[PDB]
Amino acid sequence: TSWSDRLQNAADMPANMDKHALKKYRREAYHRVFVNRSLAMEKIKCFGFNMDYTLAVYKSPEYESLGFELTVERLVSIGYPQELLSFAYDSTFPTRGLVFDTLYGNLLKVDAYGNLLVCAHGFNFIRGPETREQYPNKFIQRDDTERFYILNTLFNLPETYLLACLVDFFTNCPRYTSCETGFKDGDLFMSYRSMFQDVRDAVDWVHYKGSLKEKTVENLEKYVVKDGKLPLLLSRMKEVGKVFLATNSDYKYTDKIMTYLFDFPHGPKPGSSHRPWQSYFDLILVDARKPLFFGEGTVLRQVDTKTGKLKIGTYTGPLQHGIVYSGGSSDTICDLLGAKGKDILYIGDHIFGDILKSKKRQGWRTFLVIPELAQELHVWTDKSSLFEELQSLDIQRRIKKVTHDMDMCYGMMGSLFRSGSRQTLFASQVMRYADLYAASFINLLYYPFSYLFRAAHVLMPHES
Amino acid sequence: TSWSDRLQNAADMPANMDKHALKKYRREAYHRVFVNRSLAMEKIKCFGFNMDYTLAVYKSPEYESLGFELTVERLVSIGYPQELLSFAYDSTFPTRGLVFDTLYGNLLKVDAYGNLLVCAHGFNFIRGPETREQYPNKFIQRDDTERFYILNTLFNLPETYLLACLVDFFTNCPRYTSCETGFKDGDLFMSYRSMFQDVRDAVDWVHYKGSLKEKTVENLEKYVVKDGKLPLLLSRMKEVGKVFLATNSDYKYTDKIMTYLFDFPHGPKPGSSHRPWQSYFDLILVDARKPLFFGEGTVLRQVDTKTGKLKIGTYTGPLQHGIVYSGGSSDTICDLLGAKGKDILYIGDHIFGDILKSKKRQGWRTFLVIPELAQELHVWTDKSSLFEELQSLDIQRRIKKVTHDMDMCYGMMGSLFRSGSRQTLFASQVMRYADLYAASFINLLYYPFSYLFRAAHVLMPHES
Numbered sequence A, B: 001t002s003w004s005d006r007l008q009n010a011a012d013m014p015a016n017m018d019k020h021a022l023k024k025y026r027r028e029a030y031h032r033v034f035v036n037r038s039l040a041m042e043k044i045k046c047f048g049f050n051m052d053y054t055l056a057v058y059k060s061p062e063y064e065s066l067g068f069e070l071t072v073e074r075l076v077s078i079g080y081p082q083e084l085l086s087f088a089y090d091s092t093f094p095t096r097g098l099v100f101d102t103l104y105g106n107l108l109k110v111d112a113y114g115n116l117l118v119c120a121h122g123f124n125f126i127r128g129p130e131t132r133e134q135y136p137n138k139f140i141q142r143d144d145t146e147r148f149y150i151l152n153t154l155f156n157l158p159e160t161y162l163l164a165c166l167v168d169f170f171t172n173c174p175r176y177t178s179c180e181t182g183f184k185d186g187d188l189f190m191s192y193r194s195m196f197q198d199v200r201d202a203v204d205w206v207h208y209k210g211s212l213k214e215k216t217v218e219n220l221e222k223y224v225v226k227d228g229k230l231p232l233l234l235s236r237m238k239e240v241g242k243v244f245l246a247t248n249s250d251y252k253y254t255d256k257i258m259t260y261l262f263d264f265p266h267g268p269k270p271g272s273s274h275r276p277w278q279s280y281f282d283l284i285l286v287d288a289r290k291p292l293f294f295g296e297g298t299v300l301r302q303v304d305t306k307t308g309k310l311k312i313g314t315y316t317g318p319l320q321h322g323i324v325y326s327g328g329s330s331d332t333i334c335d336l337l338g339a340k341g342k343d344i345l346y347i348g349d350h351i352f353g354d355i356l357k358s359k360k361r362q363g364w365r366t367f368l369v370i371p372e373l374a375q376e377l378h379v380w381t382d383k384s385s386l387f388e389e390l391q392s393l394d395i396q397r398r399i400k401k402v403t404h405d406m407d408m409c410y411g412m413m414g415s416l417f418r419s420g421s422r423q424t425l426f427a428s429q430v431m432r433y434a435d436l437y438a439a440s441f442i443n444l445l446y447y448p449f450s451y452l453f454r455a456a457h458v459l460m461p462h463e464s
Ligand SMILES: Nc1ncnc2c1ncn2[C@H]1C[C@H](O)[C@@H](COP(=O)(O)OP(=O)(O)OP(=O)(O)O)O1
Pocket: A112, A142, A143, A144, A145, A150, A152, A351, A352, A429, B360
């Protein structure tokens, strides 16, 4: 049962808001908010939200699998072979945060220094001495952005698997010859770089001009987690501060999804009149273009919410009731809400585009949603004896074995957070940039108005 | 008594190499090697060294003070006012790692997120509410390299102080009007940006075309720490692996300094024949141009060691005995010594240019020398009751007060590593990029051939 089954199981539960019951619920790791740096919640004046995979968590593996099908169909329609149509999305293969190496066609799991934790070519896991042929220092240059692509988001799960499927398919299909950097089909050379670009192009097309949005919206219950407790949290937040939405999505899609997310026969709590999703927000901003949004951004536009089209021209007016913005920058939000960065708590799922960039560019407080944490915690817990076993030994053939059995419990590409005793890049970046994090933003409901999340002070080795 | 007095006090001590005496010596914090990430010393095949402030540690405050005088003299000679001649270097003012803000003329001490720990305008320490005028979020954008300059190295101590002196001088001199971004002298506007550039230009000139090198070399005992134990360490290292020198300096200067560093009436140990500094190294490389050296570098050249001039053309030959190289890249060292990055331990003092760049670009193992650690440890120790006091309270007017008295013990710009319970950027970068660090590279002498430096494994908050 997937991480989104855990999420929907907690979603079906009404909030018991008794102060005693709240403190007890957040005992459980799954309902907890984790703290990388202290944050006094009473200093927070604006709560900002992302929509996709934050407010609207798409069900797994159904959504990934829809994405994978439409990308495949798109590749087959631009000329890829019909055999692609036999692929079927497999949730047990990809882990998030993998690096595609476009030179050699390998998916890599790396730590924060670019050290190789896992290397797969197709579905062939390259170990020890064999990786040293292509990675003589067992290390990649992360600044080489033209060669290495980091697959950060849950939207990238379908392509993570599809890249391995393609490399597996071309390797084992006798119509093609394998070379170091790609495949020969007679007088045609298909490099892993141009293959990767085709997949990326196809994924982009499916979101932009394909039928992914259409398919999702015509079966929202199949694809999107809905939670009665969402309006309750938002309404509570609106009593102590301001609430905003900043999404990379367009207004028409945002309105279909948000509408559905609020579609209960009540408002914040049972018995109360239902109210439009828009009333829960002081500022709604679509077509954000994060991370560019946290730099110069783009021109501020105003949505005509009646036609779903943009009005012509740059919006020069004040924040008015019922106005929906498009584009702009993070300075728009600050100026319009009278916030400085440390007043803002921004709640997002995109480690780079939401969390890293708002923290480093603007000094916003950050809350990272990690949907898979629901499952990762259940595995971390019922395999703690294995990690604790791995911990003891470090004072060797045994270390390699335990490490592998540990990781396998998570899937073929192992845990999101570590490979044995080595932390991944993703884990590193969570700790550095996410002040808070949790399986779901909803976990904030279980903490009182002005709670002080504490992390311990950090000492250097000479200071200890 | 300065950090370089501590260093020269340990330098005057002969090595007692009895295995028992070595383990006892490295008990003491000052003779210890500190560990950020585990490193098995038996896996290290090449030890690489930087020269300036690594092998050749310049005496404090005499060297900074020579640097400050010649920079001042240079500014006065290009047209700055004669009053500059009354400045006198003051070691109690600058701390290393400060950020000059060229827009407002402030020296800032920041954490890794760009949060302001300390702000000084001239010698006026701007506190609390007053900094919020110019830094409304009490935060700087570190990616704004055109505005913010990080003063990383001990070479930058003179200009750190000189920048504050100039801002103090122009503020209080009635011939000038102070504006937000600089000084008005009638029809002349001198911005803090162009003033900063003049200082930087002057410092560059003093190293490149001025008399700093000449002055240093004609009084080496006054300016440079010499240690009988240096040839002993190098010779021990040469028995288990290869040794290299990579310096940004030119050959003529490197030869004067290195010669002096080896000038003892013995070789590695008393009684042994003295041998030239060059025999201690498998590869000598000058005019390195770090950090560009850790990317594409420059053309590999060969020094004519007889004339101290470069031979004309690119060196295409093998590593031969007695050859001295100039320029090249870090790949030169690897190819010529048959190393991969994790085989190399590079020992440097430049957090960015030596340590951060070799780690992230090449995956070298790193050892950061921090000369001031000698003093910082003595203050950390005999003021541990103050920090421990500061630690307790965190469950407020008191916190501000303790923090200030704590920092004052270090100097006006406080500790290199923290301001109260907040770590600086420099501390952050040491922990992230320096696998090992110590007050001096010599501390390695106190650890056996194949020692395993251990750091504890890191857990995420959900993993604990
Ligand atoms: N998770 C990510 N997804 C996409 N791009 C990223 C991610 N993290 C960093 N980048 C960008 C930032 C840099 O422009 C580029 C080069 O990597 P690098 O210089 O190693 O980044 P970095 O500065 O964040 O490293 P570090 O984690 O040590 O601070 O990749």
